[PDB]
Amino acid sequence: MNTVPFTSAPIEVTIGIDQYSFNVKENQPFHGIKDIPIGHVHVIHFQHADNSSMRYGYWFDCRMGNFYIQYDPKDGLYKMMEERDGAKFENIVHNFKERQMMVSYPKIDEDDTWYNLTEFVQMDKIRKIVRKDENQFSYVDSSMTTVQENELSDPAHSLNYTVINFKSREAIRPGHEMEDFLDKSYYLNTVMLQGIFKNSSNYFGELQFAFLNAMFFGNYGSSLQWHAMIELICSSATVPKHMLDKLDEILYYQIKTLPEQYSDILLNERVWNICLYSSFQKNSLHNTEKIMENKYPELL
Amino acid sequence: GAMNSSNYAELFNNDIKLFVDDTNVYRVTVHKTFEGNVATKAINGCIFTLNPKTGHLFLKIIHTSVWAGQKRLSQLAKWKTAEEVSALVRSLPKEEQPKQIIVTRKAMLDPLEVHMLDFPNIAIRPTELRLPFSAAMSIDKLSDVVMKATEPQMVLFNIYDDWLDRISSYTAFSRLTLLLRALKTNEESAKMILLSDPTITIKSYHLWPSFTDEQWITIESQMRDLILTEYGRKYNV
Numbered sequence: 379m380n381t382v383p384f385t386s387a388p389i390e391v392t393i394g395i396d397q398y399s400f401n402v403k404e405n406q407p408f409h410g411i412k413d414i415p416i417g418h419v420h421v422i423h424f425q426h427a428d429n430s431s432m433r434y435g436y437w438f439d440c441r442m443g444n445f446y447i448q449y450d451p452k453d454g455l456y457k458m459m460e461e462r463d464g465a466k467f468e469n470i471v472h473n474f475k476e477r478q479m480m481v482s483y484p485k486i487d488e489d490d491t492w493y494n495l496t497e498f499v500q501m502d503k504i505r506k507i508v509r510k511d512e513n514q515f516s517y518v519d520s521s522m523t524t525v526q527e528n529e530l531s532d533p534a535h536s537l538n539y540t541v542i543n544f545k546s547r548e549a550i551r552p553g554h555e556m557e558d559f560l561d562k563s564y565y566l567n568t569v570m571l572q573g574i575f576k577n578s579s580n581y582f583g584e585l586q587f588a589f590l591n592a593m594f595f596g597n598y599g600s601s602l603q604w605h606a607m608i609e610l611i612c613s614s615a616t617v618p619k620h621m622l623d624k625l626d627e628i629l630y631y632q633i634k635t636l637p638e639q640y641s642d643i644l645l646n647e648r649v650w651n652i653c654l655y656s657s658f659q660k661n662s663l664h665n666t667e668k669i670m671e672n673k674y675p676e677l678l
Numbered sequence: 679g680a681m682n683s684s685n686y687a688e689l690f691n692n693d694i695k696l697f698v699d700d701t702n703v704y705r706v707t708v709h710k711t712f713e714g715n716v717a718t719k720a721i722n723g724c725i726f727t728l729n730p731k732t733g734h735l736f737l738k739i740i741h742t743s744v745w746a747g748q749k750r751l752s753q754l755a756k757w758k759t760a761e762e763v764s765a766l767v768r769s770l771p772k773e774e775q776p777k778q779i780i781v782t783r784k785a786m787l788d789p790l791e792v793h794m795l796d797f798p799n800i801a802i803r804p805t806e807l808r809l810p811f812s813a814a815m816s817i818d819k820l821s822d823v824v825m826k827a828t829e830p831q832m833v834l835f836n837i838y839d840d841w842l843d844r845i846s847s848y849t850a851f852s853r854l855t856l857l858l859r860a861l862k863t864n865e866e867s868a869k870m871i872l873l874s875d876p877t878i879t880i881k882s883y884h885l886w887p888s889f890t891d892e893q894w895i896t897i898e899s900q901m902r903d904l905i906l907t908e909y910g911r912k913y914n915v
């Protein structure tokens with residue numbers, strides 16, 4: 379089990395760790411989060427009590443280094459930092475644990491939610507979507523725009539998701555205009571899977587990372603990316619059977635985890651009704667269609 | 679964006695543009711089978727592609743052979759339309775290609791956009807106007823050349839005849855749309871009006887009779903009456 383210590387909590391803040399969250403009062407004695415499961419990426423995120431604007435946070439993998447949080451009063455935010463001095467870190471953590479000034483990553487043993495939301499998400503791919511190579515962890519916030527959004531303005535602070543555009547020369551083979559636009563299998567299987575992502579795991583990892591950024595930060599461009607990647611599969615007549623079965627599982631756990639009161643902004647009516655009821659794969663997502671119908675029957 | 683009443687005069691500026699109407703591309707007769715089921719039989723159709731400033735009608739005839747062995751023909755028809763419009767643009771030299779293509783039905787936007795990805799600088803636009811171009815097959819010479827075609831064929835007509843020698847584009851387009859609106863509301867009456875007077879002939883390469891200016895004013899007045907009337911005869915007013 380790993381730990382992310384906090385130097386202090388000088389400003390009142392709601393802290394998130396994966397799908398959990400807790401309130402920390404201004405100058406409350408809080409020195410971090412312990413018992414974080416090894417083997418998964420994680421996200422630690424923040425919403426100030428004073429400015430619920432800008433949710434922000436950090437994607438990290440404790441196997442890649444010792445990370446801590448420290449408030450910066452100049453830039454006005456909780457910053458993730460790496461401690462290279464391993465004995466300094468072990469010593470700080472042990473003191474904070476001995477004084478029981480840490481909250482425990484509160485995982486129920488039966489609960490595979492986080493695994494199921496991050497199954498294909500790798501730190502190395504996160505770091506290519508979020509470019510800041512001097513750090514092993516990746517900052518994301520509510521306002522960051524995607525590379526595709528920038529085409530339609532600071533490139534250093536962008537989410538470099540894979541550009542998907544259904545009315546693009548990349549998506550449409552000369553002479554198969556109608557064929558490729560109505561059946562996007564070429565674009566999914568040849569252009570994106572074989573060509574760009576290399577395999578369906580990398581595709582699913584970007585899909586899951588886009589969902590998580592949409593959910594935890596209300597990041598609009600991420601939500602667009604998540605729906606585009608769903609739609610590209612559902613609108614392909616020819617999809618490997620294992621991809622469809624896994625997609626159904628992926629979306630099931632995303633829909634299960636979504637806050638009941640955010641579905642109005644995070645779920646695109648057109649994509650979901652098209653995907654579940656008109657698309658080639660309308661019959662292939664049984665788990666996802668059942669949870670969607672029982673939990674968001676209005677959207678449909 | 680959408681062409682409408684507000685930006686109407688843009689049609690007559692010096693930016694090359696084409697209207698595309700696909701209404702008459704896929705045309706069928708519906709009939710009973712010997713077993714008493716219903717079937718369709720396709721007949722020849724046409725794409726109506728019109729430069730409204732110059733009067734150029736690029737009539738692409740759609741021969742029934744293009745539907746052989748195909749499914750979902752109403753959907754194919756929109757993509758076939760887009761394919762032929764794209765081929766037309768590509769055939770043209772650069773300075774003669776359109777800057778905008780205005781489609782009369784919104785369902786043509788995505789098929790034409792996709793076929794024109796090679797031309798990102800050509801704007802593909804819808805319109806809110808309810809233009810009467812479906813009635814093009816009520817023009818005898820156009821209907822005749824479509825029905826006689828035995829293969830795919832592009833036929834060229836000036837839909838304004840020689841009008842532009844005496845009137846402006848704007849006025850010529852208004853005359854055309856009035857004639858077509860009339861033909862669409864009551865084809866029989868409309869055609870009676872146009873041909874009532876035997877002395878007024880149609881020139882070999884024209885579509886409409888050789889009216890004098892004063893005769894056009896009378897004709898135009900009669901077409902308005904017809905359209906107003908059929909509006910009563912339809913709504914009882």
Ligand SMILES: CNC[C@H]1CCCC[C@H]1CN1CNCN1
Binds near residue numbers: 733835
């Ligand atoms: C290729 N531009 C078209 C011209 C064809 C030859 C004669 C002048 C133009 C004819 N108009 C009539 N309707 C169709 N176009």
